[model samples]
Target: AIEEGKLVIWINGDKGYNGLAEVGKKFEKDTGIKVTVEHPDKLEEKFPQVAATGDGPDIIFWAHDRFGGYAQSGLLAEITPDKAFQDKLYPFTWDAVRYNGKLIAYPIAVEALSLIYNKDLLPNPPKTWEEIPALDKELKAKGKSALMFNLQEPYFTWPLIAADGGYAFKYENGKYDIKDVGVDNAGAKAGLTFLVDLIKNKHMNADTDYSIAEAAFNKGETAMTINGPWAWSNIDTSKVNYGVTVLPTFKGQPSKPFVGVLSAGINAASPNKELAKEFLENYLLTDEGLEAVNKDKPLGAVALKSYEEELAKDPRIAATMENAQKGEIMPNIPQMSAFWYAVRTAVINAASGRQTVDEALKDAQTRITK
Candidate 1:
């Protein structure tokens, strides 16, 4: 219980914890290091507090979305993987953990946004933005809601805009080009138009609460929804037959979903950094560890070699991995925090009919461009 120089760890108490919990136990049993996996309920507050004190967990599991703030604040450690280890990860997954040319995190799982539909209801899913409205109309004729999206969340809309060739903030010369906010870009407008038309036409359910969406889909009240593989376990499949696919193309370009990677990073302040790194090497990189985590929890892995094999066995997992290839990393830039709020406001305004697509986007651009 009191081994000196043993690694101590902290993991978020949410989804990623499942993999960590299993692996952490195995690690402790095998290495004699004392690993503590705590999902402090106040993770948002606790992380910053731990960072402020410079005594955070030796290894913390967090999302790439928060990578920018942590890195910019000097709260995270930079980790350069050995070429052999780095080569094992997916290219897109690796990109998420890198910022400003520094490799700062170890990615463990990969997820992306896409459309999941009840095949029994629609038979064929929409293949383009132009097809969404018509598909919704047909679904309504059959007493089904055509599409379901988290209208109140900006995070969910980013992929749609990207699918239409929109970028929230442009990147140039290894940095974010704040001057090129694409909130009002032509392609972004097209995406907003598609969303607004659906809401106004009653093709999509007006319910914006996630719980309500889940309930509706489970009850067979909705025909299609846009979500990630994480939600698959919660779906009630007995009521309806469902299928998953990448988001539809926009003007011949594939809809780009937001790819999210959850990673483990060593705390710079930890006295046992070496042991922590070794624990990760044994827990994450080995064939046995990989098989254990992937076989039990079943979220797609960050390693490309094993990922394809895992996907072959699970069609839903395969679709997610395939869709992730068409996705862009959700931005981890600090400015992204403000950008998200503004984008959400714009989507809400447009969906509620309070503002035209042009007006809403311009308002968002003005708010974020500052």
Candidate 2:
């Protein structure tokens, strides 16, 4: 039997958990249980290894996308959320935490990529892809570029390609059909062609990567780029006059970025299972609990609806939610590992002129399927 006086939690990193730590103190005062929050490096890699053997922390706090594999592996506890608790949070977050009908995590915050633009450099963000060409011309005359992003990264390019119906895998009947990959489909090809056209027409840099794009935007060398809320800390520190909005549409079709949910999950192997559940459902899921976290770090688009009105008052959070409402939650299955590699390589090859879009996508399709 595990000891009963203390509960251990493995937070992913050193930061973003101060408010959680504060809430832990409150939980301790109420329940006479000591809470120890630890930040161990590479939780993504270490969590599974430890949880599988029944020696993991009582709770693991991280993104929901990684829990599908954990759930399938029987590494996480099944949280049957009560109706009252279910009603308190935004319903969309539930979709991210569930896998094959089992709830794997308690959603904390929601995030998705939005068009972040330098407001002083450009008064308004573009609403459609067709408008990019003209904006590029105007910006180029000003010695700036209209747009730049990590062209070789699938996460940044997925919205552009998937806007025309491309997808890494088919999500159906509440789970993914990994066999039905769409990265090499006709619609994906169309989107790929558009990305290439942007490069060939000098509207965007062919060599742009995340750091390059970030630096360019920070320096006011680019007017806009698709980015998520996590980027705000650095951009905010830079003191750039910026605004966030939904990404521009591609040929009139809405561009959908991948939405991600951060959550706190219980480890099935922990002997303190009941206490862990009580702590999360009672303390971490409360308004006061979330408010503490928000005080430490601005929760962009909170998962709990009770806090939505207050958090949305921040324009950045409102714009993120606006775009996230149009997004697809990133797949939470193990097959996503292969999907990421195949798709990212295809983007790199196609963007660098090393391979034709069809050739690259076809190669990606083969890598994932075979």
Candidate 3:
């Protein structure tokens, strides 16, 4: 029976997802059904194409942002969590995995960016965004970056925009109103100019990428960087004593990182829907399954309240949850694609000094409509 029909799960091997192979193996042990775990190069790109043709995995694990497109397209099955099982997780996770007032999946973990400071280098971290310039001067005097992040990447830069009250879309009438694009507003411009000035003044490099920033942080070439808990895996704690906290407020406005949920969902077209749901609810949602998921790396605040209590004991998770509390859930609408690309072009153009901040933002605003 162990060699019988297999249940397929497709996901990228990252943080908690990487450790879940043991859970897959455990599932096979408990039940006679076979379980095959797949780590695709990019499941996000390939899922929809395969799912549409009824050839996708029975279950897919990924973050919540992309779930909307699949849900809207009727590619995801509606998941009904009974009241007992539903109470175990954080309330927000339910909403993150929902689309059109329908639950699309079971939320597993939470992720968001925060200010990651080198503890050995920065004993006293700045309490305000304005004070960071002083720290920059101190670090620069020591031949290190005071602050660094992937400025060209929208994921890292959007927190600055959100702190200034720029949102990609408005949730109105129980729907994400695509018409209410907010990227070119006064708040967004203010945030954009603030960062471009840093690039122009040589406080940070416009060319910095994930690897560059990460290396600088771990190698003690930078004092502070913006990233999430996943960065912990690559960091050599022996050289870089790291600490994390929520991004500082901008003139009394708090920076709200975009919260993304890693989740487990059944493919609507899968013939193994019942078996998949059975495994998810009975085995994957329990403490044993969650323990396995967190064993390799406690990636983020898990969905379970009990597990959150366990995770809170770890300083790393404690720091992340602190920022996660002040964060905003990312809207999963398909239009976010346009918003990401448009903002990337605008920020990079402004950051590189290729265009005036206003010109870059205005160009993005015009292109967002197209």
Candidate 4:
């Protein structure tokens, strides 16, 4: 594994992970371990094949979603986290990386939805669904909509259903039961209906794609939008003076988005497990190192309790953390892929009136269960 000498690392080519290469320099100097940092496209495609034989990188970095598949396949190392590191992160971050009660990943940052709005355009963002349509009308008078989002994206819409006491599948007795599908239920129908009605009444065109939805917000065609921190830099900061806050409630309950973590995993076949753990814990995960890792994405809610205090001073990071606290961990099981492809079509078809909410949602559950 890893050709016997080098401590290889595969991190996504994002700003934060690139900054980590700079941290690797220090890790190399102090430990005399040769650190090789690589950024390959479609890491998911690459990782699964390379990892099982133990020939992959000593440490692989990315989102939480793929860790479960690796863990289930026996391709991830079962880590014994030092108590110091365990106490540093939020409990759910640990929950995300665990596969059948075993830890396989190191939690890095947490992300969830924040209702981003233009300060000058809408002095007050709505607090509930009832307030949203009226606000949309007011903005429409000035050639803008009060709200916009990638409405066709099911990941974003799940919160509306969840806010009214809905969930994709029941995670009970330490397993997710696909038979417990809740997509076609009453709460889901009510919330889905509300969003579809908004799409019609607010005029976020029936054929609108993600680019049109996101571009409209950044170009000031919409006064408010719901998204995560990744969308912040895309906005022309000079043109749109936006403020972020925790998402508003749906039917008096807090909106519950899917929370996902960006993290690192160890190869089950790696001989360098001790070295990888040492480098991750003693070197990279420190408060100072985390600050560098988060320099580009200030809105990333760094996991350590000490790291989080300053985040409250920045509204975007604060809003992300606030929403994350209320959201459920995105299911990391292999079954989630079917859910992903099917839900987008479900949301798009239902919102466009190509299918009724009941039919669309039932179809989504059928495919997800298939």
Misplaced by over 4 Å in model 3 are 1-6, 15-21, 24-34
Give TM per candidate. Answer: 0.90, 0.95, 0.90, 0.94
lDDT per residue (tens digit) for residues 1-370 in model 4: 5676568889877646667777788888987878788888987779999886667788888788878888888888998897877998888787888778778889888889888898888877777866888887777888888877777677887888778877776878656787787777788888888888877775456666567767887887888888888888787564678888888898898888988888789888898888888888877778777777777445278676777877667878888999998888888887787877888788888988899989998998888888
State which candidate has the highest TM-score.
2
lDDT of 2 by residue, 48-127 (tens): 99887777788888888888878889888888778988998887788889888888889888888989999998888889
**Model-by-model lDDT, in order?**
0.73, 0.84, 0.81, 0.80
* Residues 265-359 of candidate 1: C-alpha lDDT, one tens digit per residue: 76666677677777776576566666655666665535555555655567676778778888777778877777889988898888888899999
Which ten residues in a row are the worst by lDDT in model 3? 1-10
Query: Model 3, residue 30: displacement in angstroms?
Result: 5.1
Clashes of each: 0, 0, 0, 0
Output the TM-score of candidate 4. 0.94
Each prediction's Cα RMSD? Answer: 2.7, 1.7, 2.8, 1.9
Checking candidate 4 for backbone clashes, the offending pairs are none
